[PDB]
């Protein structure tokens, strides 16, 4: 016969191994394939679709109220309207999004993100806002004069209802990672803030409080690595009916 010897690792069961194994039903003929709409081959395809950010994640905001940010006609100038923490690997407005959920099945990420906001006030309502992305290093800006120094887009409300703020991949390292420390130099992405560029202005019969819906998605220069169990789901008991599967 052939002289052989077993190596360390022999007999182990690695859940990520990749080998062929004995067919349970020999000569089985699987059902013919049929074209079905919406085939997905790489999860990166899924995260490129923008989904709603839960920006209004505050006590008092229930359900869908958490998915929209209300802006009102201001009495003062250059007013700060809201900010958004950016770690798509930690809990916050970005966690329950397509890009956030899928990314949390991984540990490393790289690539540009895009935030699109749709103004949902009445047609007669006008306004200009400034959306700013501040690369990491310091404290989140609280004044427009400071935020304005970072990456930004000035948005004019009009027929085209939505604006896109690109959060370009700006990192020293090829990838950023999750390690449960939001202030780590390899995790913190920086901040996104929104201020009135001018003001929300509406006539008497239009609502003077309008909502914005913010969306986020990854661009095609995105990459995810090192798969891990998602922290967004868990169980401490058997699900109802699980034990009945044995009866």
């Amino acid at each position: 016969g052939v002289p052989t010897y077993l190596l360390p690792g022999s007999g182990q069961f690695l859940t990520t191994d990749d080998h062929s194994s004995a067919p349970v039903l020999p000569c089985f003929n699987p059902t013919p394939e049929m074209h079905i709409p919406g085939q997905i081959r790489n999860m990166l395809e899924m995260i490129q679709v923008e989904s709603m950010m839960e920006i209004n994640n505050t006590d008092g905001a229930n359900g869908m109220e958490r998915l929209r940010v209300d802006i009102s006609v201001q009495a003062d100038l250059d007013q700060l309207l809201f900010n958004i923490p950016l770690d798509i690997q930690l809990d916050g407005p970005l966690r329950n999004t397509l890009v956030g959920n899928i990314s949390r099945y991984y540990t490393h990420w790289s690539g540009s993100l895009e935030m699109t906001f749709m103004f949902c006030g009445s047609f007669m309502a006008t306004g200009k806002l400034i959306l700013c992305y501040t690369p990491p290093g310091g404290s989140c800006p609280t004044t427009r004069e400071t935020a304005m120094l970072g990456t930004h887009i000035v948005w004019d409300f009009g027929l085209q209802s939505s604006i896109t703020l690109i959060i370009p991949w700006i990192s020293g390292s090829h990838y950023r990672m999750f390690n449960s420390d939001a202030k780590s130099t390899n995790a913190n992405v920086g901040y996104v803030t929104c201020f009135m560029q001018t003001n929300l202005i509406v006539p008497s019969e239009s609502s003077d409080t309008c909502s914005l819906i913010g969306f986020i998605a990854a661009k095609d220069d995105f990459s995810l690595r090192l798969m891990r169990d998602s922290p967004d789901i868990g169980q401490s008991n058997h699900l109802h009916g699980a034990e009945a599967a044995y009866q």
Binding site: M34, H35, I36, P37, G38, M46, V49, E50, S51, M52, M53, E54, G63, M64, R66, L67, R68, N96, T97, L98, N101, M118, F119, C120, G121, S122, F123, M124, A125, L159, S161, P203, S204, E205, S206, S207, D208, C210, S211, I213, F215, H240, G241
Partner: protein, 237 residues
């Protein structure tokens, strides 16, 4: 140019002067079942114009506290016109759908509706281990209402519902949404009375609001089956 549109099928036509382009679910278009994917061997009936036309359902009223509405297909149409008759007389059916949701208001009104076509939208019940019953699911032409739109009544989320074919009706922008749906199933045909391929959901993510004259603002749904085929002829159920 991409704001005006006319849809014409059979003896029915619809126009909108405030559209937002239109969606072709997963970039596909309805088509008849090809011989290389067919299973049922009896010659199918393809009624064409008597079934592939727009059916307008009863309207619903968009109120300040509305949670959203849904209509399952083909259930919503299983008892309407010749489409309904073919469905009742045949064990098997197959078709795509052209969906047009309508809602107009005023330049002083605000509001945003997510109009999404969900494939296999299996509903969940709230705070109980008992599965939803037949009457909780089969609402027919009247459609149903969302109990917790925030989680799409299935424990997931409306925030990520944009992963499904959809459009929005943002009052300051447009007054209609259009989605073309191809046959969506793991089988080439199906029994229309016990399985719904698609669920049309219309949910107000941004509530209706204004400070002008208050008026009833309806939401209307018109649906046109496309490339209808029926097999397994017998008596009506």
């Amino acid at each position: 140019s991409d704001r005006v549109l006319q849809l014409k099928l059979g003896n029915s036509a619809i126009v909108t002067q405030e559209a937002a382009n239109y969606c072709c679910a997963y970039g596909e278009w309805p088509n008849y079942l090809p011989d290389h994917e067919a299973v049922a061997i009896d010659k199918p009936t393809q009624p064409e114009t008597s079934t592939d036309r727009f059916y307008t359902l009863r309207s619903v009223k968009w109120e300040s506290n509305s949670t959203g509405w849904w209509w399952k297909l083909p259930d919503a149409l299983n008892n309407i016109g010749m489409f309904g008759q073919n469905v009742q007389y045949h064990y098997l059916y197959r078709s795509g759908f052209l969906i047009h949701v309508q809602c107009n208001a005023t330049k002083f009104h605000q509001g945003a509706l997510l109009v999404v076509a969900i494939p296999e939208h299996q509903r969940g019940a709230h705070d109980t281990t008992t599965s939803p019953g037949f009457n909780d699911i089969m609402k027919g032409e009247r459609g149903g209402t969302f109990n917790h739109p925030y989680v799409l009544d299935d424990g997931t989320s409306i925030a990520c519902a944009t992963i499904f074919p959809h459009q929005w009706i943002n009052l300051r922008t447009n007054n209609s949404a259009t989605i073309v749906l191809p046959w969506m199933n793991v089988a080439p045909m199906d029994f229309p009375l016990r399985h719904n391929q698609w669920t049309l959901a219309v949910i107000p993510v941004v509530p209706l609001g204004t400070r002008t004259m208050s008026s009833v603002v309806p939401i209307t749904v018109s649906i046109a089956p496309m490339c209808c085929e029926f097999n397994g002829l017998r008596h009506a159920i």
